[PDB]
């Protein structure tokens, strides 16, 4: 940087900071990554300059024919990377992307069948206290109590019973593949509309490493920073019959003007995400968690499903006692970082849990493969079997330093 | 730039385009500006990186320490810029912040009295095909028939009459200055909550050049990019007794993990608006508008209000018989950037109108002064009142162009 450190040199010094401690710790919240210096570019650009209400070709501003270019690149990349339709590369954030689908397919009110909350749906799931749950009538589907698996049978009796407009598939805390075209044959079966918030798996379906919702879904949510490895934002996919509608829903529907430099960066990801390089780093993704996965078995830990098909693990803490928020504490004081996570079925309630939501795609970003993965494993191990010893906690403090350089 | 250019030439071929451009018209679209390299060097960082949801000391996540205080800064610099009891920095956009500021006071199908929109009202206060008017029963206060200044008596029988849980008072196309303490007084003698859409004015406001709405209104949402000159994104401001739930409001309410390179880049813009220099731009923008008001009527066109207290101005193209959208697309061939505006009024619709909008805020930020005014004025006057001579607009073209270097 150049102008910031001199001009504020409070606000170069916690940045700085930040830029230090992501390379100081071990960073396992399963949402997270690391972006490239190119995206970074894109978004420190003048493109932040310009309102650009309305869509490439159909703006309500004139001067918009660059910010065009920049946005139908997004737009097609993202075609190209999904096979979808039609994208939406406005919205400012997964919320955002969820709650212009929201808008589009419902009046207030009406009914949505989800993913229980405590077994991995997310918060813009229907969560009481969020905008989902508040405006309409959310409605849950869980996971087997044994496998933890997402039950189908259970999706579909929620559906007929309750007949939902919209069903929505996905989640933030789920280790397994999630089969769309069981739940789009679920939504036909009732007349719903079909909702795949593929957030957290988007780069590994990029990738090919996770089944591709679009061709299920009649609308696909995201954000563009997870797996996906972009900027912080969102995007809608959708067939082209819906594409004027969602359009409208994005605006003048719920948002204003577009980020331009973040929908730039937005571009310059889906052009990572094409290449062959990014396909090599979602493998190790999924390569590591396994490894990881299996690694922590190996150490005594239960993990929610027994495994992971993805980037993310659930590690079910009752067989040590632990409760997710202890042990995220404890991590975080070796340098670990980790997101307490309810449990399905949990005993404890969602400020405690009963366990830790763990993520690979970090630390592969940074290159760590099946031997750090291997060390990680081995690190939480001695951390969480031995919460009172200082010794064990120091000594993972110099393993983690040896990990992070 | 440096790995920008090398790993995508097609988007950074785009941003070097938009880049040029921003330096060679003339930007008069009153809600933009340019803003520093500091402030796009924080957006620019890896701060981006960070998953903050909650607030500082008070997150969701571990690893927050040093974003946090980013975050704070922010907020700290807002209260000492407008003197609020609180801040939250995360809305994602001036949208986001109407949008929680409204998911906090009011339950859907609440009566909400706003500016008319064709008087100068946002799109998010009521329009029909926006979250605003659909969910809430949005009805409207105008401008007077002849000097187009709000007209405080139709304010209090509109309070009156439809009972408002919510009063919205500013405005995206309004010239003069707002009584924020009559809007008040009436909101009382309702009993309705009041909120202020400073958007447009902000930077004024922190300069002291427009009456400050904090003292009286229970909410304040804004821009960060417009007269205030930050990155594009949102605040909001309110009494402490409403603190936690626009917080909450904010988030788990209505958006999810905030953008904290954004946050950063806020901290920054709000840093420079309490430098002494930013005031002395402040007071140039308004001493510039006002000139270029000035030099317009000598031209011989109207302007709505007959003239401008604050960024801003509007021209009733009516006497030259000109539509809003003709006038833009001739000052566009030019090299000049407005927007058509209906004006209060309006016998055209809202995708003709009878008026473009101008501010200049932005040329200001480019060190234009008086003389550039006179200058921008004259050229308008030369391509408005020739519109069918291409002699006079290469003319305007040769004058646009000597102003711009
Ligand atoms: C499946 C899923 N969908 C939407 C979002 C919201 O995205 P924002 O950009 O944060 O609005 C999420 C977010 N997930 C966070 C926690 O909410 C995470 O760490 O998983 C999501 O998971
Ligand atoms: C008064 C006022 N309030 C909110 C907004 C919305 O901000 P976003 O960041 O764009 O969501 C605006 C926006 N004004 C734009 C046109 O909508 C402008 O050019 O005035 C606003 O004016």
Same mark, same amino acid.
């Given at each position: 940087?150049?102008?910031?450190?001199?001009?504020?040199?409070?606000?170069?010094?916690?940045?700085?900071?930040?830029?230090?401690?992501?390379?100081?710790?071990?960073?396992?919240?399963?949402?997270?990554?690391?972006?490239?210096?190119?995206?970074?570019?894109?978004?420190?650009?003048?493109?932040?300059?310009?309102?650009?209400?309305?869509?490439?070709?159909?703006?309500?501003?004139?001067?918009?024919?660059?910010?065009?270019?920049?946005?139908?690149?997004?737009?097609?990349?993202?075609?190209?990377?999904?096979?979808?339709?039609?994208?939406?590369?406005?919205?400012?954030?997964?919320?955002?992307?969820?709650?212009?689908?929201?808008?589009?397919?419902?009046?207030?009110?009406?009914?949505?069948?989800?993913?229980?909350?405590?077994?991995?749906?997310?918060?813009?799931?229907?969560?009481?206290?969020?905008?989902?749950?508040?405006?309409?009538?959310?409605?849950?589907?869980?996971?087997?109590?044994?496998?933890?698996?997402?039950?189908?049978?259970?999706?579909?009796?929620?559906?007929?019973?309750?007949?939902?407009?919209?069903?929505?598939?996905?989640?933030?805390?789920?280790?397994?593949?999630?089969? $769309? %075209? *069981?739940?789009?044959?679920? +939504?036909?079966?009732? =007349?719903?509309?079909?909702?795949?918030? /593929?957030?957290? !798996? #988007?780069?590994?379906?990029?990738?090919?490493?996770?089944?591709?919702?679009?061709?299920?879904?009649?609308?696909?949510?995201?954000?563009?920073?997870?797996?996906?490895?972009?900027?912080?934002?969102?995007?809608?996919?959708?067939?082209?019959? $819906? %594409? *004027?509608?969602?359009?409208? +829903?994005?605006?003048? =529907?719920?948002?204003?003007?577009?980020? /331009?430099?973040? !929908? #730039?960066?937005?571009?310059?990801?889906?052009?990572?995400?094409?290449?062959?390089?990014?396909?090599?780093?979602?493998?190790?993704?999924?390569?590591?968690?396994?490894?990881?996965?299996?690694?922590?078995?190996?150490?005594?830990?239960?993990?929610?499903?027994?495994?992971?098909?993805?980037?993310?693990?659930?590690?079910?803490?009752?067989?040590?006692?632990?409760?997710?928020?202890?042990?995220?504490?404890?991590?975080?004081?070796?340098?670990?970082?980790?997101?307490?996570?309810?449990?399905?079925?949990?005993?404890?309630?969602?400020?405690?849990?009963?366990?830790?939501?763990?993520?690979?795609?970090?630390?592969?970003?940074?290159?760590?493969?099946?031997?750090?993965?291997?060390?990680?494993?081995?690190?939480?191990?001695l951390?969480?079997?031995?919460?009172?010893?200082?010794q064990a906690?120091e000594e993972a403090r110099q393993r983690?330093?040896?990990?992070?350089?």
């Amino acid at each position: 940087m150049k102008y910031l450190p001199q001009q504020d040199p409070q606000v170069f010094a916690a940045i700085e900071q930040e830029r230090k401690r992501q390379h100081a710790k071990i960073e396992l919240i399963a949402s997270e990554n690391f972006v490239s210096r190119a995206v970074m570019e894109a978004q420190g650009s003048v493109l932040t300059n310009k309102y650009a209400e309305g869509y490439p070709g159909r703006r309500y501003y004139g001067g918009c024919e660059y910010v065009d270019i920049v946005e139908e690149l997004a737009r097609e990349r993202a075609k190209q990377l999904f096979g979808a339709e039609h994208a939406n590369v406005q919205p400012h954030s997964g919320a955002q992307a969820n709650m212009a689908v929201y808008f589009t397919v419902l009046e207030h009110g009406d009914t949505v069948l989800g993913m229980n909350l405590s077994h991995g749906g997310h918060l813009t799931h229907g969560s009481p206290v969020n905008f989902s749950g508040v405006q309409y009538n959310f409605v849950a589907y869980g996971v087997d109590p044994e496998t933890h698996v997402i039950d189908y049978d259970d999706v579909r009796e929620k559906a007929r019973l309750h007949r939902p407009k919209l069903i929505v598939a996905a989640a933030s805390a789920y280790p397994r593949i999630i089969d $769309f %075209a *069981k739940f789009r044959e679920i +939504a036909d079966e009732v =007349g719903a509309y079909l909702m795949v918030d /593929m957030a957290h !798996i #988007a780069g590994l379906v990029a990738a090919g490493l996770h089944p591709n919702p679009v061709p299920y879904a009649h609308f696909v949510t995201t954000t563009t920073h997870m797996t996906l490895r972009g900027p912080r934002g969102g995007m809608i996919l959708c067939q082209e019959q $819906f %594409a *004027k509608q969602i359009d409208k +829903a994005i605006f003048p =529907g719920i948002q204003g003007g577009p980020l /331009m430099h973040v !929908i #730039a960066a937005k571009a310059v990801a889906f052009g990572e995400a094409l290449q062959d390089d990014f396909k090599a780093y979602a493998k190790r993704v999924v390569d590591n968690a396994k490894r990881l996965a299996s690694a922590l078995q190996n150490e005594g830990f239960t993990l929610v499903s027994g495994g992971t098909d993805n980037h993310l693990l659930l590690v079910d803490l009752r067989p040590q006692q632990l409760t997710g928020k202890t042990a995220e504490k404890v991590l975080d004081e070796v340098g670990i970082t980790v997101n307490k996570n309810t449990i399905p079925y949990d005993p404890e309630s969602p400020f405690v849990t009963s366990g830790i939501r763990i993520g690979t795609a970090a630390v592969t970003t940074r290159g760590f493969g099946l031997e750090e993965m291997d060390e990680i494993a081995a690190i939480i191990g001695l951390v969480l079997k031995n919460v009172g010893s200082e010794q064990a906690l120091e000594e993972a403090r110099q393993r983690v330093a040896a990990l992070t350089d």
